[PDB]
Design an enzyme around this catalytic site. Structure first.
Site, short mmCIF file in Angstrom:
data_model
loop_
_atom_site.label_atom_id
_atom_site.label_comp_id
_atom_site.label_asym_id
_atom_site.label_seq_id
_atom_site.Cartn_x
_atom_site.Cartn_y
_atom_site.Cartn_z
N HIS E 61 14.25 -6.63 16.20
CA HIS E 61 14.09 -5.94 17.84
C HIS E 61 13.21 -5.84 18.40
N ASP E 91 10.98 -14.28 50.88
CA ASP E 91 11.33 -15.21 49.46
C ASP E 91 10.08 -14.55 49.12
N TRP E 126 6.04 -5.78 15.47
CA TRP E 126 6.00 -7.05 16.34
C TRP E 126 4.73 -6.57 16.27
N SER E 156 4.86 -16.52 31.19
CA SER E 156 5.66 -16.02 32.36
C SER E 156 5.15 -15.22 33.03
N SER E 157 5.05 -14.03 32.47
CA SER E 157 4.76 -12.80 32.68
C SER E 157 3.08 -12.72 33.22
N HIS E 240 -1.36 -1.09 24.66
CA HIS E 240 -0.72 0.78 25.48
C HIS E 240 -0.55 0.01 26.88
N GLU E 242 0.62 -2.36 27.67
CA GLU E 242 2.16 -3.08 27.76
C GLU E 242 3.49 -1.04 28.09
N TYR E 244 2.50 0.99 29.62
CA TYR E 244 2.90 1.70 30.51
C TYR E 244 3.83 0.43 31.31
N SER E 255 12.05 6.97 41.49
CA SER E 255 12.27 7.48 42.49
C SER E 255 13.00 6.92 43.69
N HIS E 290 -6.09 5.10 19.66
CA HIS E 290 -4.73 6.06 19.51
C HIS E 290 -4.17 5.19 19.16
N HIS E 291 -3.67 4.01 18.99
CA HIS E 291 -2.86 3.56 17.51
C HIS E 291 -3.18 3.30 16.54
N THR E 316 1.70 11.80 34.94
CA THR E 316 2.65 11.87 35.34
C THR E 316 3.08 13.09 35.56
N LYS E 319 4.06 13.36 38.58
CA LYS E 319 5.38 12.43 38.90
C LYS E 319 6.50 13.01 38.68
N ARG E 438 7.79 4.49 8.66
CA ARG E 438 7.15 3.28 9.01
C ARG E 438 7.80 2.19 8.07
C1 HEA Z 1 7.34 3.63 27.51
C2 HEA Z 1 7.11 3.73 26.56
C3 HEA Z 1 6.30 4.70 25.95
C4 HEA Z 1 5.16 5.23 27.59
C5 HEA Z 1 5.58 5.48 28.16
C6 HEA Z 1 4.80 5.74 26.13
C7 HEA Z 1 3.70 6.95 26.18
C8 HEA Z 1 3.06 7.74 26.04
N1 HEA Z 1 1.98 7.71 24.98
FE1 HEA Z 1 3.47 6.68 23.32
N2 HEA Z 1 4.30 4.71 22.28
C9 HEA Z 1 5.04 3.45 22.47
C10 HEA Z 1 5.54 4.07 23.65
C11 HEA Z 1 5.52 4.92 24.61
N3 HEA Z 1 4.62 5.85 24.55
C12 HEA Z 1 4.98 2.50 21.38
C13 HEA Z 1 6.39 1.84 21.52
C14 HEA Z 1 4.63 3.62 20.64
C15 HEA Z 1 4.63 2.94 19.07
C16 HEA Z 1 3.47 1.74 18.81
C17 HEA Z 1 4.01 0.96 17.42
O1 HEA Z 1 2.65 1.28 16.93
O2 HEA Z 1 4.93 -0.12 17.58
C18 HEA Z 1 4.03 4.58 20.93
C19 HEA Z 1 2.79 5.02 19.95
C20 HEA Z 1 2.04 6.44 20.77
C21 HEA Z 1 0.72 6.56 20.48
C22 HEA Z 1 -0.06 6.46 18.73
C23 HEA Z 1 1.09 6.71 17.48
C24 HEA Z 1 0.78 6.57 15.64
O3 HEA Z 1 0.94 4.71 15.24
O4 HEA Z 1 0.23 7.21 15.26
C25 HEA Z 1 -0.30 7.43 21.06
C26 HEA Z 1 -1.13 8.62 20.87
O5 HEA Z 1 -1.52 8.84 21.71
C27 HEA Z 1 1.41 8.19 21.95
C28 HEA Z 1 0.82 8.21 22.68
C29 HEA Z 1 1.14 8.67 24.28
C30 HEA Z 1 1.25 9.26 25.25
C31 HEA Z 1 0.05 10.17 25.85
C32 HEA Z 1 1.96 8.82 26.18
C33 HEA Z 1 1.50 9.47 28.05
O6 HEA Z 1 2.12 8.67 29.07
C34 HEA Z 1 3.94 10.61 28.33
C35 HEA Z 1 2.94 11.40 29.10
C36 HEA Z 1 4.18 11.98 29.38
C37 HEA Z 1 4.36 13.54 29.23
C38 HEA Z 1 3.25 14.43 28.65
C39 HEA Z 1 5.13 14.44 29.77
C40 HEA Z 1 5.90 14.07 31.56
C41 HEA Z 1 4.79 15.19 32.09
C42 HEA Z 1 4.78 16.91 32.42
C43 HEA Z 1 6.48 17.45 32.36
C44 HEA Z 1 3.63 17.51 32.68
C45 HEA Z 1 3.02 18.88 31.62
C46 HEA Z 1 2.27 18.11 30.35
C47 HEA Z 1 1.54 18.51 29.51
C48 HEA Z 1 0.80 19.64 30.76
C49 HEA Z 1 1.56 17.93 28.39
N4 HEA Z 1 2.01 6.18 21.75
CU LIG Z 2 -0.86 3.62 23.12
#
Ligand code: HEA
Ligand SMILES: [Cu+2]
Ligand SMILES: CCCCC/C=C\C/C=C\C/C=C\C/C=C\CCCC(=O)O[C@H](COC(=O)CCCCCCCCCCCCCCCCC)COP(=O)(O)OCCN
Ligand SMILES: CCCCCC/C=C\CCCCCCCCCC(=O)O[C@H](COC(=O)CCCCCCCCCCCCCCC)COP(=O)(O)OC[C@@H](O)CO
Ligand SMILES: CCCCCCCCCCO[C@@H]1O[C@H](CO)[C@@H](O[C@H]2O[C@H](CO)[C@@H](O)[C@H](O)[C@H]2O)[C@H](O)[C@H]1O
Ligand SMILES: CCCCCCCCCCO[C@@H]1O[C@H](CO)[C@@H](O[C@H]2O[C@H](CO)[C@@H](O)[C@H](O)[C@H]2O)[C@H](O)[C@H]1O
Ligand SMILES: CCCCCCCCCCO[C@@H]1O[C@H](CO)[C@@H](O[C@H]2O[C@H](CO)[C@@H](O)[C@H](O)[C@H]2O)[C@H](O)[C@H]1O
Ligand code: CUA
Ligand SMILES: [Mg+2]
Ligand code: NA
Ligand SMILES: [Zn+2]
Lengths: 105, 58, 49, 227, 514, 43, 79, 98, 46, 259, 84, 144, 73
Positions: E61, E91, E126, E156-157, E240, E242, E244, E255, E290-291, E316, E319, E438
């Site tokens: 999945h 192109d 995964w 590819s990427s 990580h 990935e 972003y 946007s 942080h993972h 963020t 934005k 999980r």
């Molecule tokens: C598109 C996918 C995506 C994105 C963009 C993000 C973005 C972020 N992720 Fe996430 N994350 C995942 C997909 C994503 N994550 C996935 C798949 C996993 C699991 C991996 C796995 O184990 O399989 C995971 C796991 C994961 C962990 C590990 C947890 C664990 O396994 O125990 C952490 C820890 O810090 C984390 C943190 C964050 C943070 C801080 C952001 C930041 O980028 C978010 C920033 C956004 C904001 C804060 C909101 C907008 C901001 C405002 C409105 C401003 C004001 C806000 C404040 C003052 C706080 N993510």
């Molecule tokens: Cu991460």
């Protein structure tokens, strides 16, 4: 930047240019309605008289509609502006959208 | 060696509609056919190998 | 000239809402789903040991 | 353990887990406030026929929405890091216990004095005694003295596992070749449950942890009887 | 002619169409796998079998949704169609290499299907961590087929990243600086830099896994002095960045959509938007551990990774607030694409905030490897990346096809999906806080109510996916051809008509310097 | 956006056919597999 | 002599979560001491602190494997 | 011992590369490699936009450092104005290659 | 050259909406069905 | 007719044959590792070589023979090659990270030391120092070749490029002998793993870079390069300096510091 | 650093040929001498069946499964010791 | 009036309240009487009739502001159809419960739950807030 | 009849924004006060009250007499 009165005077001057052309009439109205304001009657007066010099009755009616639109929910603004423009409307024979039935949905 | 690039420029700019990978002549078609046959044949064989490997064999 | 929403919008809204409520209430209550709600205020504890 | 329809954390059994509860309340208030503010401003931007479509200068407002989020982050990080360094403080344990993960069960070693070790397997559903909890009971619980600082050392003899007890705020990965340390202190007697927390194959869902916290004198007699 | 056009393409629009079709097919696979997960969990007990079949489904999945749906649709599909048009280029820089980036993906997907058909599948997650993914606990071909699938998707990427960076740097009009390119083009450039730097580290890590499994190396095996945790560092140094890579093209599309349906000529705060995407790209390389907060790292390292992760909220937030300021004062058109973008702003904000909760390593001890993480990442993936994909698909479908959707059906589709995803994932926060792990095929009885509701939500999202197929059919079935599109003066990709001719910008735009 | 009227209009009956066929294409094969799970699991 | 041993004390050489080297070092120290004592004619009793510490910290299977490898001649640490 | 034997571009460049080289030597830019410099853009002094057909897309950067480009088709005939800033442009169609 | 225009810049025909429905059914339905048949395959082994 | 300077490439089969070659090589490696057979792998390697040959042949046809590489196209190919080299740097960075992880914290199974108990490293002052002098010398001779080409000197370009290739071959033969003579193997724990995978991927890149230089040698024999237009030579030289710099990092890290 | 050489004026083909024949190839010749001087087999050490060496978790996909790819019987023992 | 696909690069007509004066007139071709009306528009507009004035407006523009800004009943269709399809989803769930799911474990039987609830209270599960805190141990009943 | 007064005509969007951003701020402060009183302080007081006179041995004896322990009968 500039005072309200300075802004209004530039826009009156813009529409009062004797040989203003159709493109300049449209550019002026389409630019003016991007601002956060309903234009003062003296601006609208100058734009309606530009329509008269351009032999464009329909655009004069449309400009009255866009005054009502820019006022949003402030339903007191358009009747005020029409009141202030009545001598020009009478002089130029401009019918309001309401008099033409064009306020009906 | 002599510089024969001008001869190859004439050949590859001839107004004959051929795409570049065939514009050298008949040898290009042969090498293309060999390549594509090995690729498509090999790909079918890989699918057969998947069929085979997808089931246990005692 | 009335469009599709003028002609049928009231009926789509009323019929869809009535259908959705009826079938989710039936699913939630009549087919033996175990929701496992809290025992607090619901379950009389019974001797186990 | 968790109870039906639970919304938040298990009640704290340890002082560090109480600290985490209060820190989470603080951070969740912030999360709710910012989420609500964004939803509200969306609704505000979308509910007027008034317009302003010319170019808008951004410089002033970008000071606000970088400085205010930076301040909020500092107000989260300060208590967050305080708890982090508290959890790490020196504490002087009275007992060391090891746990080794296996596919699919946990073994425990208490070798400060005598050679005490045993395996701990889930009770199968068909063998639960009346009132026992599906997927959470074990045959041999991890009996420990209450109100005492315990060093737990965690490892694995095969794949990764992870040793977790939510109500004590504990989760330490079980890694072959590695001996990870955590500290455990229960403020209360009782039975405290956890579950393997790293995917480890066919029966990952079925290798739970049950701590049994009792007074020291009962722990000592239990230990002796397990030799 | 058909083979020449569709198997031998060197055209950015046709290659984009191939990626959109591939990504749509992968999205059906990924949706089926998600329904199997939620069928297993929708009542207590065992439905399919033990955790091996269950986590083969969970692992596939994630790989399908990430590598075969989101990245092909956003970068291969919307990037190839839109980037050359938005800069007036004829192109991509390497139009023939672009075609190989596409054609590597059907083999990559075939390898992943093969991994699940042979032996007992790759039930690894995964993340593919050893030793579970090694040759004793996952003997036989399944994990090697998964590694090779990832190798092909990575080539590819990486080639695609080379192509996009080159095209966007080198093929703009000579007067257009990088600060006159649209935000979607910026978002694709930044994503491509992240792919270029991160995928080779993944490739190194999974190659070391392949040799430990087949050549008797011991990179990750303590018996030879290796370390399972080294694989976690190499994987997450890619993983990580990935996430972003998954969200940044979505931010670019959001946007454009918010600007367009607000009736504005430009997004609020363009240079701040560029700054924020670059900052997010940079910070996304220095936070990976942080993972790994429960693996046994030193306290000062935990403190660093907590703080560096939280700082990403600042760019963020710029934005999010800039999207709100773009709405401000707009003549709002309540189009289906706008609904997707407004859903995105709010629900991505919620998911980002629970990400900030997880960044606190002390709290993450209790949240790691629980459904609180699953709730965080599905708010940013199913309600973030996917909402940007659906908003961009509904907005640009008439450009790509020349036909319009039925907007009432598209609003119905948005409404159904919105209910379904929230019903699926909101209760998973409670499951996580109360300790559900999980990768479990079954749970202690206390967790039944929220698992039942979450599975009911997943069936509502199924109904929305089925309806989306019907909506695309109805548009091609009815053939309502586009006439006039507004705001072309600030949306160059529409100015060649709908669909644009096969060759566009054969005569480049004229842009002077003044 | 503006557009031409449909070149080949799809009536409500035609939409009901397309919708029903689309839904059945997803639901019948998965339903067949899930209905027969027990037959598979013990074999 | 400094008995009433309860468990291994905090050791500033090994202050972090990973305690592998604490177990290893004390196992080495015990067996190095034991070899020294048996050679020069002495009492292994003087090695007892290291014995107690490695027995507290070290997994049983680690100690067993290391013991087997010392008997086989394949223990890779220096004793 | 510096010898020869390496062809020069003048000797051996061909195709479009050679066309670009020879045009550059003449100071000509038929293949649009350089940015055109604006005129004052009045109706008396419009920016002159070459084309090989009877319409071409113009992008107008109305003021220095604007990030928004304003795009429109310029058609053969009377000069047209940028819809944002009003600056004038006039199409100059011609024969083969710019 | 190639065909240009709506309905012509795609690798599938939209000339007949019912043939198109069949093709779309087979396309999207085969992707959705595959995981169910792979699960079936994995259960029927052992 | 276009009036921009960019290259619209003729529809080509080589992307598809390259993608299928990748399927055949990977499914082939799987068949070799698990089903005791090299057949698919051999087909994949063959179709991969055929694809590379015809694709790069067509790039030469498009540029030397058809004139499509305007300065704008050449500038794009410069960026493409720089970005490709950056991706290869990051690939090697993963293997250096593995090496420093394992050697800076040697585990108890190694003896708690580096090099591990039982490992007898090569002497970095013997053939590894010779290999270093060989690749550094080849960086000097490829620079002579570049300046000869720019100055229009066919004979000395060919001489210098031949010397560069000879040195690349010498390095490869020396490394192959060192592999055979080494008393440790890829299966000798993490020391052998890091040593042979990292130097082995480097040796693969030396073979790739030497092949690329040989292509340039024969193109130069056929007068393809002008004194100002020779991007394939520039790209091969950049790739060759990358292979030299990776070796310097391997030598300092694995052979010297790690001994 | 300026090394200790010092030409420039113009970096050119003549200077890079001077460096190739005057510094680079002499250095290769010197290192070739140093190497083909310290060759000649050095004795092989006692075999000890250390468990972190001679790893076999899966047979190799060539030969008998138990020989490394560039196995040298003189210096590479099998898990059971040196060949005979 | 008739807008054609091949017109896509020409200035076009739009009704947008933020772009009141579009780039072209709605109607560009004029009949004899419409030509005479545009001539009459060059004289005093007080001499135009109401109908002539409406006709001039409708030559220049397609919809008035009131027309282009009108609300619709579309929300009723959207919300109602969405509720229908959500309702349809419950049919799928009913089918799944009937044909796919087997019995759930015996630990959800009423007697089991009553005994398990007493045991949870005996080990004081969540005694500060979550669970046993809601039981009155002195009165042996749930707190009111 | 009488004339209509001149209303405010400028800055109506900005005035609306200012008024509701201020209102959002006041509501945010009110919620933070409510939440501190209803959640955070409630939890602090629940734990402090529980432990203030808590007797761990008595708790143990109740659990032991209820038969819950393996190590204590
Ligand atoms: C598109 C996918 C995506 C994105 C963009 C993000 C973005 C972020 N992720 Fe996430 N994350 C995942 C997909 C994503 N994550 C996935 C798949 C996993 C699991 C991996 C796995 O184990 O399989 C995971 C796991 C994961 C962990 C590990 C947890 C664990 O396994 O125990 C952490 C820890 O810090 C984390 C943190 C964050 C943070 C801080 C952001 C930041 O980028 C978010 C920033 C956004 C904001 C804060 C909101 C907008 C901001 C405002 C409105 C401003 C004001 C806000 C404040 C003052 C706080 N993510
Ligand atoms: Cu991460
Ligand atoms: C002379 C210098 C160069 C020599 C090259 C020799 C062949 C290697 C070919 C490619 C090398 C690249 C790295 C491959 C990994 C391992 C090979 C390492 C180098 C090498 O050749 O190592 C040999 C082992 O080869 C072995 O296992 C098996 C060797 C063959 C199997 C290779 C397996 C396939 C690898 C898949 C790679 C995936 C790449 C993905 C990239 C994605 C982007 C060492 O011999 P030994 O007998 O153990 O010790 C010497 C004892 N006297
Ligand atoms: C098992 C098999 C594994 C792989 C084995 C690979 C084996 C050997 C491959 C060696 C690489 C050969 C590359 C030959 C390229 C020839 C075409 C070329 O060089 O083309 C040049 C353009 O450069 C261009 O495309 C530059 C394009 C090529 C860049 C290639 C860089 C190397 C990539 C190799 C793959 C690396 C894989 C790493 C795996 C870990 C043509 O332009 P010019 O030279 O200016 O000429 C024009 C003048 O004549 C005009 O006057
Ligand atoms: C036109 C494009 C190209 C299309 C290519 C199609 C190739 C098809 C040839 C396959 O032939 C099979 O090959 C197997 C292996 O390849 C053989 O197994 C054999 O091979 C092993 C490898 O040597 C032996 O060790 C085993 O004993 C034995 O099972 C097996 O007999 C044979 O049926
Ligand atoms: C294309 C989509 C297909 C949609 C078609 C709708 C599917 C309908 C299938 C039959 O539904 C069953 O009805 C039974 C009869 O009610 C239920 O038994 C139930 O009946 C009792 C009361 O009716 C409950 O108390 C029991 O627990 C329970 O077994 C059962 O579970 C269900
Ligand atoms: C998560 C994705 C799936 C979600 C829910 C799917 C909803 C299922 C739709 C219906 O599926 C059909 O259901 C029939 C039962 O209603 C099955 O007939 C089966 O049962 C009939 C009645 O017992 C027999 O007549 C048939 O022969 C026997 O195949 C049939 O095979 C299956 O295609
Ligand atoms: Cu053990 Cu999961
Ligand atoms: Mg984990
Ligand atoms: Na289950
Ligand atoms: Zn302008």
């Amino acid at each position: 930047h500039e005072t309200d009165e300075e802004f209004d005077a530039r826009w009156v001057t813009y529409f009062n240019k004797p040989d203003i052309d159709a493109w300049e009439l449209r550019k002026g109205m389409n630019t003016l309605v991007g601002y956060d304001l309903v234009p003062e009657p003296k601006i609208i007066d100058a734009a309606l008289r530009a329509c008269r010099r351009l032999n464009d009755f329909a655009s004069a009616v449309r400009i009255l509609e866009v005054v009502k639109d820019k006022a949003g929910p402030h339903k007191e603004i358009y009747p005020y502006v029409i009141q202030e423009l009545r001598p020009t409307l009478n002089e130029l024979g401009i019918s309001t959208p309401e008099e033409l039935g064009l306020d009906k949905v | 060696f002599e510089n024969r690039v001008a001869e190859k420029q004439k050949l590859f700019q001839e107004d004959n509609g051929l795409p570049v990978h065939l514009k050298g002549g008949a040898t290009d078609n042969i090498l293309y056919r060999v390549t594509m046959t090995l690729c498509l044949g090999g790909t079918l064989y890989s699918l057969y190998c998947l069929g085979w490997a997808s089931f246990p064999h005692k | 000239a009335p469009d599709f929403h003028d002609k049928y919008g009231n009926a789509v809204l009323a019929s869809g809402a009535t259908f959705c409520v009826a079938v989710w209430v039936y699913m939630a209550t009549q087919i033996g789903i175990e929701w496992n709600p809290s025992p607090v205020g619901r379950v009389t504890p019974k001797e186990w040991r | 353990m968790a109870y039906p329809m639970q919304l938040g954390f298990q009640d704290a059994t340890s002082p560090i887990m109480e600290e985490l509860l209060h820190f989470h309340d603080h951070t969740l208030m912030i999360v709710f406030l910012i989420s609500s503010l964004v939803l509200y401003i969306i609704s505000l931007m979308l509910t007027t026929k008034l317009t302003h479509t010319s170019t808008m200068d951004a410089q002033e407002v970008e000071t606000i929405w970088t400085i205010l989020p930076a301040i909020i982050l500092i107000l989260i990080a300060l208590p967050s890091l305080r708890i982090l360094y508290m959890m790490d403080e020196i504490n002087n344990p009275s007992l060391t216990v090891k746990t080794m993960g296996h596919q699919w069960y946990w073994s425990y070693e208490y070798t400060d004095y005598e050679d005490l070790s045993f395996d701990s397997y889930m009770i199968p559903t068909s063998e639960l005694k009346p009132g026992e909890l599906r997927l959470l009971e074990v045959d041999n619980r991890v009996v420990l003295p209450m109100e005492m600082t315990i060093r737990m050392l965690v490892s694995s003899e095969d794949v990764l596992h992870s040793w977790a007890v939510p109500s004590l705020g504990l989760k330490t990965d079980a890694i072959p070749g590695r001996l990870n340390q955590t500290t455990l202190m229960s403020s209360r007697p009782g039975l405290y449950y956890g579950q393997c927390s790293e995917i480890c194959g066919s029966n990952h869902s079925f290798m739970p942890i049950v701590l049994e916290l009792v007074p020291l004198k009962y722990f000592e007699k239990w230990s002796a009887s397990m030799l | 002619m058909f083979i020449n056009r569709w198997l031998f393409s060197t055209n950015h629009k046709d290659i984009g169409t191939l990626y959109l079709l591939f990504g749509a097919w992968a999205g059906m696979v990924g949706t089926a796998l998600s329904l199997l997960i939620r069928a297993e969990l929708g009542q207590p007990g065992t439905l399919l079998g033990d955790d091996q079949i269950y986590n083969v489904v969970v692992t596939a999945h994630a790989f399908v949704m990430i590598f075969f749906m989101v990245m092909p649709i956003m970068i291969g599909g919307f990037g190839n169609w839109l980037v050359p048009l938005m800069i007036g280029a004829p192109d991509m820089a390497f139009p023939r290499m672009n075609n190989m980036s596409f054609w590597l993906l059907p083999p990559s997907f075939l390898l992943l299907l093969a991994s699940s058909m042979v032996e007992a599948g790759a039930g690894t997650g995964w993340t593919v961590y050893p030793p579970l993914a090694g040759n004793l606990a996952h003997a036989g071909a399944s994990v090697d087929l998964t590694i090779f699938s990832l190798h092909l998707a990575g080539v590819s990427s990486i080639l695609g990243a080379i192509n996009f960076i080159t095209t966007i740097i080198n093929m703009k009009p000579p007067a257009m600086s990088q600060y006159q390119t649209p935000l979607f083009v910026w978002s694709v450039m930044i994503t491509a830099v992240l792919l270029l730097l991160s995928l080779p580290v993944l490739a190194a890590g999974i190659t070391m896994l392949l040799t430990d499994r087949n050549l008797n190396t011991t990179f990750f095996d303590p018996a030879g002095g290796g370390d399972p945790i080294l694989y976690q560092h190499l994987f997450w140094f890619f993983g990580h960045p990935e996430v972003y890579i998954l969200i940044l093209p979505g931010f670019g599309m959001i946007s454009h959509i918010v600007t367009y349906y607000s009736g504005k000529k430009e997004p609020f705060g363009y240079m701040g938007m560029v700054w924020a995407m670059m900052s997010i790209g940079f910070l996304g390389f220095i936070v990976w551990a942080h993972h790994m907060f429960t693996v046994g790292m030193d306290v000062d390292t935990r403190a660093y990774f907590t703080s560096a992760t939280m700082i990403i909220a600042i760019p963020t937030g710029v934005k999010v607030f800039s999207w709100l300021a773009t709405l401000h004062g707009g003549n709002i058109k309540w189009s289906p694409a706008m609904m997707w973008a407004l859903g995105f702003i709010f629900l991505f904000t919620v998911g980002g905030l629970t990400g900030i909760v997880l960044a606190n390593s002390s709290l993450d001890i209790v949240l790691h490897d629980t459904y609180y993480v699953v709730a965080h990442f599905h708010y940013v993936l199913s309600m973030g990346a996917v909402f940007a994909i659906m908003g961009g698909f509904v907005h640009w479908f008439p450009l790509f096809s020349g036909y319009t959707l039925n907007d009432t059906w598209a609003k119905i589709h948005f409404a159904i999906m919105f209910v379904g995803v929230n019903m699926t994932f909101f209760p998973q926060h409670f499951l996580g806080l109360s300790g559900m792990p999980r990768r479990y095929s079954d749970y202690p009885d206390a967790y039944t109510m929220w698992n039942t509701i979450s599975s009911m939500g997943s069936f509502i999202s199924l109904t929305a996916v089925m309806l989306m197929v019907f909506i695309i059919w109805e548009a091609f079935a009815s053939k309502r051809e586009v006439l006039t599109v507004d705001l072309t003066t600030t949306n160059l990709e529409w100015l060649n008509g709908c669909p644009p001719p096969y060759h566009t910008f054969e005569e480049p735009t004229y842009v002077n310097l003044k | 956006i503006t557009a031409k009227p449909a070149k080949t209009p799809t009536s409500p009956k035609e939409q009901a056919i397309g919708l029903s066929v689309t839904f059945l294409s997803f639901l019948l094969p998965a339903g067949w597999v899930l209905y027969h799970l027990d037959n598979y699991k013990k074999s | 002599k400094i008995k009433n041993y309860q468990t291994a004390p905090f050791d500033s050489r090994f202050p972090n979560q990973n305690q592998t080297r604490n177990c290893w070092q004390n196992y080495l120290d015990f067996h190095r001491c034991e070899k020294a004592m048996t050679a020069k004619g002495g009492d292994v009793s003087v090695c007892e602190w290291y014995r107690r510490v490695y027995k507290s910290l070290c997994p049983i299977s680690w100690v067993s494997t290391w013991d087997d490898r010392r008997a086989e001649g394949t223990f890779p640490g220096k004793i | 011992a510096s010898g020869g034997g390496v062809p020069t571009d003048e000797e051996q460049a061909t195709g479009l590369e050679r066309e670009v080289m020879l045009a550059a030597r003449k100071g000509q830019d038929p293949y649009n490699i350089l940015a055109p410099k604006a005129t004052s853009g009045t109706k008396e002094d419009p920016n002159l936009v070459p084309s090989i057909t009877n319409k071409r897309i113009v992008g107008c950067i109305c003021e220095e450092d604007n990030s928004t480009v304003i795009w429109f088709w310029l058609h053969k005939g009377e000069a047209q104005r940028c819809p944002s800033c009003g600056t004038h442009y006039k199409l100059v169609p011609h024969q083969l290659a710019h | 050259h190639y065909e240009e225009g709506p309905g012509k810049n795609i690798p599938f025909s939209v000339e007949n909406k019912w043939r198109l429905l069949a093709m779309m059914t087979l396309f999207f339905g085969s992707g959705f069905a595959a995981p169910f048949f792979i699960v079936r395959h994995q259960l029927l082994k052992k | 007719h276009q009036t921009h300077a960019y290259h619209m490439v003729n529809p080509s089969p080589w992307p598809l044959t390259g993608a299928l070659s990748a399927l055949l090589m990977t499914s082939g490696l799987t068949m070799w590792f698990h089903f005791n057979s090299m057949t698919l792998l051999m087909i994949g390697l063959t179709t991969n070589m055929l694809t590379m040959y015809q694709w790069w042949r067509d790039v030469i046809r498009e540029s030397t023979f058809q004139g499509h590489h305007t300065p704008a196209v050449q500038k794009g190919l410069r960026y493409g090659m720089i970005l490709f080299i950056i991706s290869e740097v990051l690939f090697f960075t993963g293997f250096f990270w593995a090496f420093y992880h394992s050697s800076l914290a040697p585990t108890p199974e190694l003896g708690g030391c580096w090099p591990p108990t039982g490992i007898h490293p090569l002497n970095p002052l013997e053939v590894p120092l010779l290999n270093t002098s060989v690749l550094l010398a080849s960086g000097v001779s490829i620079t002579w070749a570049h300046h000869s080409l720019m100055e229009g000197d066919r004979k000395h370009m060919l001489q210098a490029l031949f010397i560069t290739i000879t040195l690349g071959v010498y390095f490869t033969l020396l490394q192959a002998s060192e592999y055979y003579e080494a008393p440790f193997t890829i299966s000798d724990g993490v020391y052998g793993s890091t040593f042979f995978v990292a130097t082995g991927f480097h040796g693969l890149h030396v073979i790739i870079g030497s092949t690329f230089l040989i292509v340039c040698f024969f193109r130069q024999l056929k007068f393809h390069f002008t004194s100002n237009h020779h991007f394939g030579f520039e790209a091969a030289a950049w790739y060759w300096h990358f292979v030299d710099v990776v070796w310097l990092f391997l030598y300092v890290s694995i052979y010297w510091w790690g001994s | 650093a300026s090394a200790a050489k010092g030409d420039h004026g113009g970096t050119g083909a003549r200077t890079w040929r001077f460096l190739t024949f005057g510094l680079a190839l002499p250095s290769v010749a010197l290192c070739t001498l140093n190497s083909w001087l310290h060759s000649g087999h050095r004795e092989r050490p006692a075999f000890i069946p250390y468990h972190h060496l001679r790893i076999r978790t899966k047979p190799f996909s060539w030969g008998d499964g138990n020989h490394t790819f560039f196995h040298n019987p003189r210096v590479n023992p099998l898990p059971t010791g040196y060949e005979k | 009036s008739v807008v054609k696909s091949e017109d896509y690069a020409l200035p076009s007509y739009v009704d947008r309240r933020d772009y009141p004066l579009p780039d072209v007139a709605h109607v560009k071709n004029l009949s004899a009487s419409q030509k005479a009306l545009k001539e009459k528009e060059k004289a005093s507009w007080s001499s135009l009739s109401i109908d002539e004035k409406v006709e001039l407006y409708r030559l220049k523009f397609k919809e008035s502001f009131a027309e282009m800004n009108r609300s619709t009943n579309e929300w009723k269709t959207v919300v109602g159809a969405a509720m229908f399809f959500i309702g349809f989803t419950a049919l799928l769930l009913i089918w799944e419960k009937h044909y796919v799911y087997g019995p759930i474990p015996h630990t959800f039987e009423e007697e089991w739950v009553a005994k398990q609830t007493k045991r949870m209270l005996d080990m004081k599960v969540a005694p500060i807030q979550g669970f046993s805190a809601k039981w009155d141990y002195d009165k042996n009943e749930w707190k009111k | 009849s009488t004339a209509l007064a001149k209303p405010q005509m400028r800055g109506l969007l900005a005035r609306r924004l200012r008024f509701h951003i201020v209102g959002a701020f006041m509501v945010s402060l009110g919620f933070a006060t409510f939440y501190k009183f209803a959640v955070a302080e409630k939890r602090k007081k629940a734990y402090a009250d529980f432990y203030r006179n808590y007797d761990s041995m008595k708790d143990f004896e109740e659990m032991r007499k209820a038969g819950i322990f393996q190590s204590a009968k």
